[PDB]
Design a protein around this ligand. Sequence first.
Ligand code: EMC
Ligand code: EMC
Ligand code: EMC
Ligand code: EMC
Lengths: 90, 90
Amino acid sequence: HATPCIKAISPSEGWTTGGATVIIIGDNFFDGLQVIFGTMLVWSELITPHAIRVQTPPRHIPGVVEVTLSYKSKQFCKGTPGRFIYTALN
Amino acid sequence: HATPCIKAISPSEGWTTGGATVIIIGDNFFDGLQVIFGTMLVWSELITPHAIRVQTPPRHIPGVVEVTLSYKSKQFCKGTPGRFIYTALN
Ligand code: EMC
Ligand code: EMC
Ligand code: EMC
Ligand code: EMC
């Protein structure tokens, strides 16, 4: 299908303080594609039609989150969500 | 420990004629790092310590290649190399 799809993300770990640049790669990306990162909608930008750059949001609490894709307030469910582990320095 | 390594490549397939923009994600990337497509070495452009950008070199014959990294004429090899598949239009 031509539905947006995440292959992998790097880095897949980051501090709770956030702000680190994450690259999401996969299939069928387009400008306007929204990225949802631990439930927060983040600013994003296509590097190519196969790569997206986002900054990690801050997160109150350490642990695994999902990275998913959405457009016009409607999420896509093709494939496997990106997985990102927040860690606390503290 | 601090060694450049490939997690994934997007897209992982290209035409034998080369020139395609490819994003490679991983860890420990830096300025001046080079990429080997089977036997062909190309330059990269750093995006973050976790992603680089290359243009695929042409390959005379279609097929699967191992993708590895290099710096100062010295190839790295940590973990599982990347896989890129050349396809012919003909
Ligand atoms: C299911 C391939 Hg991004
Ligand atoms: C978990 C359904 Hg997009
Ligand atoms: C530890 C292989 Hg990027
Ligand atoms: C041939 C695996 Hg460094």
